Paper text:
Serum albumin (SA) is the most significant transport protein of vertebrates; it constitutes up to 60% of all plasma proteins. SA consists of three loose domains, that are almost structurally identical and mostly helical. The whole structure is maintained by 17 disulfide bridges, which ensure durability of the overall protein fold and simultaneously allow its flexibility. In this paper, we present crystal structures of three animal serum albumin complexes: ovine, caprine, and leporine, with diclofenac, a popular non-steroidal anti-inflammatory drug that is used in therapy of chronic and acute pain.
In CSA-DIC, a significant change in the conformation of the loop (500–508) surrounding the FA5 pocket is observed. The ligand molecule in the CSA-DIC complex creates the highest number of interactions. It is slightly shifted towards Ser488, making a polar interaction between its carboxyl group and hydroxyl group of Ser488 possible. As a result of its deeper location in this site, the ligand interacts almost with all the side chains of polar residues that are present in the pocket, but it loses the Cl2 chlorine contact with the main chain of Ile387. In the DIC2 binding pocket in the CSA-DIC complex, the change of Met547 side chain conformation increases the space where a ligand is bound. In the CSA-DIC structure, the carboxyl group of DIC2 is rotated toward the side chain of E548 and makes additional interactions with the oxygen atom of peptide bond of K544 and nitrogen atom of E548. The DIC5 of caprine albumin is anchored deeper in the FA6 pocket, whereas in the ovine albumin it sticks outside. In the CSA-DIC complex, the DIC6 molecule is localized in a unique place, inside the IIIb subdomain, covering the FA5 binding pocket. Diclofenac is bound in a loose and partially open pocket. The carboxyl group of DIC6 creates hydrogen bonds with the main chain nitrogen and OG1 oxygen of Thr507.
Numbering used by the authors: 1 to 583
């Protein structure tokens, strides 16, 4: 809800620590290249202004919107001109256009330095000033992930500070904290990906897509709840995500906290797993709620055919109350299959909807849609062979070889895409093998659909930033939930025109020899992509031959006395072997 003085309302509701953290995340995400200390100064200003309005809400400016107050502060910054180019034209503008402009310049691949944990340095900053150290975490993560779910980031900052509580007085510091940080990293990065999808769903596919996703998710977590209660939570959760995805972080966090309280107050009718969550403080409580994945299927439920195929009013309901009805389908399907991937459940609803659009026009609709559930069950099973084949490949060759097989597959599909993006995405796809292939047989498909949804959304976000392939555009935009089928269906892109081999220009040198081992692995994956960009029709056996040659040449020359000399002499020999091989 809104108050006359929104700044006072949210300061009152959130309290000063969380208010400050949230405002710092806002500024970090709007202005990702700006330094920490400049952000801190604006947050302090606004905080101090907040306190003025709490004490006297009649004070000048206290009835301004949050965007006005945020924006005026962003426009103090002189360097907006230098550091952002045509974004200081946001500052030239006034609200509500200004805020929109700022939002549009969030950068999904800002290319800041890779963060590296240095235990002694970190421990000393923690000692010096814990609050600054917390703030610095919020800043560094937020600016790398400009749609990170902001109240979840506050929870993670508290966990981060806890790692250093534990480890800094420990004798051996890095032994204690490096693995903690590694673990936290993978969890934060997963969280950012799941939120980036949520935000894509609303931004690119509309509020109705986000509602659809929410009804499916919530029905797997709280399947014993009634539809009217699930739908209440959907309405609230949808408002929360809309706010967070739009950069309305103070409202997001406040509404989130209210929704956590509602959930906990109604825990007996929603899920027994809430018992672990509901006596925690707000941020941890909310995180715990988010972490719940599923409950048991309620006993004694009727077949879905009753409401969705037998009922004489199926067409009526589809026609007159379409959103409610598709919502009910989602709730009822989801609650019966709480282990399914959400994207699959949505894929089913979409086909159900398509079935009704075709059949409800006919003289005997029921004749036409009576068997729709059998078609849906088949749709669930469609990719089981290929998933099995993928997991068999992973088992036979391991993660790095599985990534290599994916580089080939994906480069053929989308050869226009940049080499760093093809490598990033293919390595992430290969990690799906490790995360999913030793799940129970029956849990593999939902595992792989879930991660694929996240990884392909990353692809699509990177592609939006600089579009290069009509086929990737098409798959990214045709339908959010059928992205995985779309991309799987793509074949070699014959639209692509390869540039010739720069046959006189040989491009590899002895500085490869000193790389850390994982960087040596990436260098070989980069080489593979480039080989495919020059000879996009090469066979698997050809690419293997050439890559084998390449790695023997690198090993031979990195072990030589004169290393660069070997690269220079034998490099031309490599190009010759390669040519003969790619005929
Ligand atoms: O304010 C303090 O006492 C500690 C401190 C030191 C350096 C930088 C920031 C902060 N605190 C702080 C932070 Cl970490 C973020 C936003 C607003 C404030 Cl006041
Ligand atoms: O490592 C990342 O890419 C982000 C990330 C997520 C969770 C925890 C830490 C980090 N990065 C990071 C590192 Cl590597 C060191 C010190 C402080 C930070 Cl925020
Ligand atoms: O729209 C809302 O705020 C919640 C609501 C309540 C009852 C029925 C449908 C909906 N929303 C909704 C919509 Cl608009 C589309 C697909 C799935 C759902 Cl749950
Ligand atoms: O791509 C396919 O045809 C099979 C398929 C279906 C559902 C989910 C994932 C996958 N494939 C797949 C798998 Cl199983 C793991 C890692 C990367 C990919 Cl592309
Ligand atoms: O030498 C280069 O990097 C460019 C070039 C020119 C002619 C023939 C092949 C290549 N590159 C090349 C070779 Cl020779 C082997 C494996 C991977 C690559 Cl990218
Ligand atoms: O030398 C080899 O053949 C192993 C190798 C090294 C670097 C890059 C790729 C490959 N192998 C390879 C190739 Cl070229 C394609 C698909 C799957 C695999 Cl394992
Ligand atoms: Cl949440």
């Amino acid at each position: 809800d809104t108050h006359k003085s929104e700044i006072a309302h949210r300061f009152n509701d959130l309290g000063e620590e969380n208010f400050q953290g949230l405002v710092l995340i806002a500024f970090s995400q709007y202005l990702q290249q700006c330094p920490f200390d400049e952000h801190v100064k604006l947050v302090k200003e606004l905080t101090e202004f907040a306190k003025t309005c709490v004490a006297d809400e009649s004070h000048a400016g206290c009835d301004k919107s949050l965007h006005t107050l945020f924006g005026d502060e962003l426009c103090k910054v002189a360097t907006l001109r230098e550091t952002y180019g045509d974004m200081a034209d946001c500052c030239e503008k006034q609200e509500p256009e200004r805020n929109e402009c700022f939002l549009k310049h969030k950068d999904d691949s800002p290319d800041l330095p890779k963060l590296k944990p240095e235990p002694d340095t970190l421990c000393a900053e923690f000692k010096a000033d814990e609050k600054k150290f917390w703030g610095k975490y919020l800043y560094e993560v937020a600016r790398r992930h400009p749609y990170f779910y902001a109240p979840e980031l506050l929870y993670y900052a508290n966990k981060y500070n806890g790692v250093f509580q534990e480890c800094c007085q420990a004798e051996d510091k890095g032994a204690c904290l490096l693995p903690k940080i590694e673990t936290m990293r993978e969890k934060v990065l997963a969280s950012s990906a799941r939120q980036r999808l949520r935000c894509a769903s609303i931004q690119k596919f509309g509020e109705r897509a986000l509602k659809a996703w929410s009804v499916a998710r919530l029905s797997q977590k709280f399947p014993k709840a009634d539809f009217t209660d699930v739908t209440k939570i959907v309405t609230d959760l949808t408002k929360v995500h809309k706010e967070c995805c739009h950069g309305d972080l103070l409202e997001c966090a406040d509404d989130r906290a209210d929704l956590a309280k509602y959930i906990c107050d109604h825990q007996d009718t929603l899920s027994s797993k809430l018992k672990e969550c509901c006596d925690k403080p707000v941020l941890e409580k909310s995180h715990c709620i988010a972490e719940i994945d599923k409950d048991a299927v309620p006993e004694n439920l009727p077949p879905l055919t009753a409401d969705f195929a037998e009922d004489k009013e199926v067409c009526k309901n589809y026609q007159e109350a379409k959103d409610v009805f598709l919502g009910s389908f989602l709730y009822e399907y989801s609650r019966r299959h709480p282990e399914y991937a959400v994207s699959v459940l949505l894929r089913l609803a979409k086909e159900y909807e398509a079935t009704l659009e075709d059949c409800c026009a006919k003289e005997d609709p029921h004749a036409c849609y009576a068997t729709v559930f059998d078609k849906l069950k088949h749709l669930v099973d469609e990719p089981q062979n290929l998933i099995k084949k993928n997991c068999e490949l992973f088992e036979k060759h391991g993660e790095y070889g599985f990534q290599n097989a994916l580089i080939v597959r994906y480069t053929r599909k989308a050869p226009q895409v940049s080499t760093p993006t093809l490598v990033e995405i293919s390595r992430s796809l290969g990690k799906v093998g490790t995360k999913c292939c030793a799940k129970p047989e029956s849990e593999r498909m939902p595992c792989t659909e879930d991660y694929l949804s996240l990884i392909l959304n990353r692809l699509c976000v990177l592609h939006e930033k600089t579009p290069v392939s009509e086929k990737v555009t098409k798959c990214c935009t045709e339908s959010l939930v059928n992205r995985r089928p779309c991309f799987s269906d793509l074949t070699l892109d014959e639209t692509y025109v390869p540039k010739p081999f720069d046959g006189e220009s040989f491009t590899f040198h002895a500085d490869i020899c000193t790389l850390p081992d994982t960087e040596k692995q990436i260098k070989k994956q980069t080489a593979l992509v480039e080989l495919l960009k020059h000879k996009p029709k090469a066979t698997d056996e050809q690419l293997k031959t050439v890559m084998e040659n390449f790695v023997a040449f690198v090993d031979k020359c990195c072990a030589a006395d004169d290393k660069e000399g070997c690269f220079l002499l034998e490099g031309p020999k490599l190009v010759a072997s390669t040519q003969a091989a790619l005929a």
